Amino acid sequence: MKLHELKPAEGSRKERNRVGRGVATGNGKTSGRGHKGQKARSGGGVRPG
Amino acid sequence: MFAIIETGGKQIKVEEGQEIFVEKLDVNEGDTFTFDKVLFVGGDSVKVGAPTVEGATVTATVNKQGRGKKITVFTYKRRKNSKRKKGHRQPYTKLTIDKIN
Amino acid sequence: PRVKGGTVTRARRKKTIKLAKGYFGSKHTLYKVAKQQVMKSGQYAFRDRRQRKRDFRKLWITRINAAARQHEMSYSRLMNGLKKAGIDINRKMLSEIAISDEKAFAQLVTKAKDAL
Amino acid sequence: AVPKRRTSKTRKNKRRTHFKISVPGMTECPNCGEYKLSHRVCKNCGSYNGEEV
Amino acid sequence: NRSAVSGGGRKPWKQKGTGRARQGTIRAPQWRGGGIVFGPTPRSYAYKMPKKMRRLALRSALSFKAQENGLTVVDAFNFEAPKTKEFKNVLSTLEQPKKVLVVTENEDVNVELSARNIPGVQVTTAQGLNVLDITNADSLVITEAAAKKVEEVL
Amino acid sequence: MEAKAVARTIRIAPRKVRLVLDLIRGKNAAEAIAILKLTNKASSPVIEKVLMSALANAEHNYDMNTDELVVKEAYANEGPTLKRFRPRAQGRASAINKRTSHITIVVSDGK
Amino acid sequence: MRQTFMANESNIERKWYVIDAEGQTLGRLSSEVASILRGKNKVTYTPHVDTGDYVIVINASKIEFTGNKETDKVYYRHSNHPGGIKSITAGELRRTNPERLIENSIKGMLPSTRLGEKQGKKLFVYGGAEHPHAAQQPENYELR
RNA sequence: GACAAUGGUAGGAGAGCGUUCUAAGGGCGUUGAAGCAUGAUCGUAAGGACAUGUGGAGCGCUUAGAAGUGAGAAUGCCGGUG
RNA sequence: UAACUUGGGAGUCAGAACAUGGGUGAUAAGGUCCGUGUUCGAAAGGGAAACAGCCCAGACCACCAGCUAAGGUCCCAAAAU
RNA sequence: ACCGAUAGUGAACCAGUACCGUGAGGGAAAGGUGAAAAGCACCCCGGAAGGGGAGUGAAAUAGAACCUGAAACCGUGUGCUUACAAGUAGUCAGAGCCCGUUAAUGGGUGAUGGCGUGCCUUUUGUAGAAUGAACCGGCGAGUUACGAUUUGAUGCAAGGUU
Ligand SMILES: [Mg+2]
Ligand SMILES: [Mg+2]
Ligand SMILES: [Mg+2]
Ligand SMILES: [Mg+2]
Ligand SMILES: [Mg+2]
Ligand SMILES: [Mg+2]
Ligand SMILES: [Mg+2]
Ligand SMILES: [Mg+2]
Ligand SMILES: [Mg+2]
Ligand SMILES: [Mg+2]
Ligand SMILES: [Mg+2]
Ligand SMILES: [Mg+2]
Ligand SMILES: [Mg+2]
Ligand SMILES: [Mg+2]
Ligand SMILES: [Mg+2]
Ligand SMILES: [Mg+2]
Ligand SMILES: [Mg+2]
Ligand SMILES: [Mg+2]
Ligand SMILES: [Mg+2]
Ligand SMILES: [Mg+2]
Ligand SMILES: [Mg+2]
Ligand SMILES: [Mg+2]
Ligand SMILES: [Mg+2]
Ligand SMILES: [Mg+2]
Ligand SMILES: [Mg+2]
Ligand SMILES: [Mg+2]
Ligand SMILES: [Mg+2]
Ligand SMILES: [Mg+2]
Ligand SMILES: [Mg+2]
Ligand SMILES: [Mg+2]
Ligand SMILES: [Mg+2]
Ligand SMILES: [Mg+2]
Ligand SMILES: [Mg+2]
Ligand SMILES: [Mg+2]
Ligand SMILES: [Zn+2]
């Protein structure tokens, strides 16, 4: 293989999903949190269990 | 002299030497096309198809196979963070009517 | 590494503003209100492509009605007679014929009346 | 009370239609030929009504 | 971040009554000169793979050279003093491409010093072989002793 | 042929200067001069000096006949604004814009 | 393929007609006249231009109503002053201004657009049997 | 070739556009880079070219890698100007 | 033409009108609480003047082609004076 | 595979300065002529400022916070258009007039007709007379570390791995 023709194994890599970057992504605005309540807050959500 | 021809799910009133634009035909530029559905012939002698005038034909020369001017299809629903933008260029065939019948 | 805001913002907004050419005052000048107007323009154009087909059929029907009445026949009965005669000329073509050569339209009218 | 909506460039300029000044009421001094205010002494030559001031 | 930026202790103005947006410190992130939200923070990017995979990678790079015919075996480098011009002539006579990886069995001072200044020529030992160097090179020039040592190791 | 003169950063607001420029735009030079002399506004002497400078270069630099010249162009562009304040009641201060004008006059023989 | 004819001022021909109100019912005469004024009787009807004809209505004073409209049909108007409602019965208006009666009946059947106002200006109504427009050489027109 | 599906908020899934940096390869540039400006250009979208003017020295492209990677709204912060 | 099992990720826990079976209220409420259906919510298009919740009907894109639904056909306003 | 002048130190610059506070203390803004200063002799209008020439320079349209010079905003000129009209300002249809392009079944304007109550947020439902934004620009929000779990990938496999 050549350094200008590198290729990762098929299916080994996937681009990370980025929230809060516009409505078309489907994760803009509320960024997948829905609306309000404890779980919509930075650091929100109850203890596991 | 004019004829009513059916093509591309539409109808066109044509005279000889007239340029027409129709839905894409399966032909090449410079070919000769024959329209075989003539509903009506007007002018000196009138012929009324029921629905088509039997044996009547309109010949034409294929000038161009093009794509219509770009349409930007855009819609949205206010307050819903919901919209869609798409482009469209409708294919067309341009021909010149050579002979009626 | 840091990615500064750069040029993309201006390029994108300028495109919307150019699409707003000819609008009134601030609507051809300010990105926010131009964007809004261009959104409205797209929605209106989508709607009106469909409304245009309705409007032109309406125009053809009106003109055919006038021609039929000149031959002592209503639009409705003329279309019914043409149907029973088996004539498939559509309203656009009927209107253009009635406008462009009246003798041909009179022959169509007689065919309709005979069928009725 | 305060403006409920800003004033468009168009509306502002319509309002300013009549906001302007006029050319002074002036005529040529019959003595020295320079322009003067009608019914005023001519400042160039000091003359008025064919006499010096 | 907002803790790190200088100053910013006090509340810039009272919570209510002034008509302004409520604010808690002049160094909040939306403020010009404020603290950065997240952003880079020093860290290592190094990671490991299993040893067997390391060895397989090295063998794969060497096999790629062998199959591309970019493998040349030389009896020895008999350099007594460093001479870049002589090493350049040796490369030209061996008909080597621009990018050459020279492999000795052990550290060869005169070969290293003669090749060091030639653009595109890298020198290594059998123990020092690595995937990046092999892959970057167009051709490998390996002494017979070095080749035998590599063969033993892998 | 045209001759130009500019007075930059005149400490008069452009709205005010343009009131007077609108009187002389497109008129003959002598009539314009008289209009400026007999118009009672702050910008009249400043504009007059610009006009006289423009006529002077028409004569000296381009050997134009000054008695046939017309004010072809006259306009004021915005210069940089001096920012000031006025103390108002209850400890507040309110802005004062001391605006400036770039005044351009262009005279022409029409040829 | 777009082929629809569009009338315009270069090719529009407006004729003059005379219609006799005598013995005719207000509304029925009015609807027919409105069609004429709008050009709905022309094969070249084109919505954005006035393709209609001029109409003179004579003997407006002899227009007729059915039922008890003479005393019971009331025309209201408002002066835009408080309490400024004024009313007049259809019979009284027929007696005192039959021309206005017909004009308002017809103009209420035309669109409230710039074009509709223009088209309504092509109507001329007279209470008696005479009109002053012989110069336009109008033709008699038979209703229905 | 056929014929079937394709409204959509929270939300799940997928494929992509564009930004800065790095690696390797291959290129462009004072016979004028980036930036900016204009145009009647191209793509299904994000967006991509080309020409001309301005500008005056840097910049694409391909594959892969990495992120301070995309703003219209926070009585947001700073500046400029109404 | 679905269904079920296991595992990864969720959101939701303010609902509305209309019709109908009922409680409550006064066989009051655009009231309130349950049952059942639809629609809105998250649905544009045609009708109901205008009119989320009614009636018809579910927009992949293009056409200056055709047939219909609810509703309509004297003029506004397409179609029967 | 850190920043590149709203970033990076608060401070690229005479900054813990200016400024604010009785005091502890708080705390800015502000970089760029040109290769070379060759930094515009001389003439002209002006009291000066400022300008027009001339000259220096590749360039002054690089002339002193002097590389580039976007937008808001302000002006001058003009092709089309507008003083009987009810406008979320567009959209679809469309004469007339003026042009002539990345040459494409072109560009600008728009008499007149149809249709049509911004955007965001929040809501059962908002043209909403509920919330937010004067405008433009820049800046401004799921990150990283270490653990867990699951899926994909790859190596080896009763072994795997340090
Ligand atoms: Mg993705
Ligand atoms: Mg969603
Ligand atoms: Mg948003
Ligand atoms: Mg989620
Ligand atoms: Mg929210
Ligand atoms: Mg809630
Ligand atoms: Mg929740
Ligand atoms: Mg950078
Ligand atoms: Mg930004
Ligand atoms: Mg306020
Ligand atoms: Mg900082
Ligand atoms: Mg005080
Ligand atoms: Mg969908
Ligand atoms: Mg569907
Ligand atoms: Mg997802
Ligand atoms: Mg960011
Ligand atoms: Mg209720
Ligand atoms: Mg309730
Ligand atoms: Mg229920
Ligand atoms: Mg609906
Ligand atoms: Mg409706
Ligand atoms: Mg039918
Ligand atoms: Mg009709
Ligand atoms: Mg800068
Ligand atoms: Mg700083
Ligand atoms: Mg600072
Ligand atoms: Mg500059
Ligand atoms: Mg008028
Ligand atoms: Mg909701
Ligand atoms: Mg409420
Ligand atoms: Mg209001
Ligand atoms: Mg609130
Ligand atoms: Mg507000
Ligand atoms: Mg802003
Ligand atoms: Zn005198």
Side-chain angles (χ1 to χ4, degrees), chain F residues 6-14 76-84 96-103:
Chain F
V6 184
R8 293 208 164 92
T9 79
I10 297 302
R11 230 306 293 161
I12 302 172
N77 286 321
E78 300 176 340
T81 301
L82 300 180
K83 300 296 181 60
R84 301 289 183 264
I96 299 294
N97 308 99
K98 289 208 187 322
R99 297 172 180 279
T100 65
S101 296
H102 304 323
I103 305 168

Side-chain angles (χ1 to χ4, degrees), chain A residues 33-37 39-40:
Chain A
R33 291 190 177 253
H35 283 283
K36 294 197 191 180
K39 294 168 66 58

Side-chain angles (χ1 to χ4, degrees), chain B residues 21 64 66-69 76-81 89 92:
Chain B
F21 301 79
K64 179 162 187 177
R67 301 217 294 165
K69 176 70 173 178
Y76 76 104
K77 291 196 159 59
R78 62 180 160 194
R79 300 187 289 263
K80 303 316 174 197
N81 288 308
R89 298 191 66 182
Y92 71 83

Side-chain angles (χ1 to χ4, degrees), chain G residues 30-44:
Chain G
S30 289
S31 52
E32 291 203 42
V33 167
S35 299
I36 292 169
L37 292 165
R38 289 200 76 220
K40 296 287 293 308
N41 303 333
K42 289 186 189 174
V43 305
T44 54

Side-chain angles (χ1 to χ4, degrees), chain C residues 7 12 24 40 48 55 82-83 89 93 113-114 116:
Chain C
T7 68
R12 172 178 58 77
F24 176 84
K40 284 290 289 196
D48 286 341
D55 294 337
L82 291 178
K83 178 190 172 57
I89 301 168
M93 298 292 95
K113 287 178 179 175
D114 292 352
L116 292 177

Side-chain angles (χ1 to χ4, degrees), chain F residues 14-110:
Chain F
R15 292 196 60 205
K16 302 186 191 194
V17 175
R18 296 194 279 245
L19 287 183
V20 173
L21 295 179
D22 292 341
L23 292 182
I24 64 166
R25 184 168 306 105
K27 300 208 160 58
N28 301 317
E31 174 174 32
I33 293 168
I35 288 167
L36 292 172
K37 278 175 182 171
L38 301 176
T39 291
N40 173 44
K41 306 290 277 182
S43 58
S44 293
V46 180
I47 296 167
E48 188 185 12
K49 282 192 172 187
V50 183
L51 169 52
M52 298 301 297
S53 188
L55 294 170
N57 9 67
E59 182 177 13
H60 176 271
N61 298 339
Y62 313 115
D63 58 70
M64 281 189 266
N65 174 219
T66 49
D67 68 77
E68 301 168 2
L69 302 181
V70 301
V71 183
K72 181 181 174 49
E73 297 174 350
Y75 54 92
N77 286 321
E78 300 176 340
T81 301
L82 300 180
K83 300 296 181 60
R84 301 289 183 264
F85 303 84
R86 180 137 297 276
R88 305 294 293 270
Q90 287 156 354
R92 163 196 53 263
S94 58
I96 299 294
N97 308 99
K98 289 208 187 322
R99 297 172 180 279
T100 65
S101 296
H102 304 323
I103 305 168
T104 293
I105 297 287
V106 181
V107 300
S108 177
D109 58 23

Side-chain angles (χ1 to χ4, degrees), chain A residues 8-27:
Chain A
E10 294 294 342
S12 68
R13 305 250 168 193
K14 171 145 84 178
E15 189 187 354
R16 68 191 295 173
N17 179 247
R18 281 148 61 245
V19 305
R21 296 301 189 280
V23 301
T25 66
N27 280 353

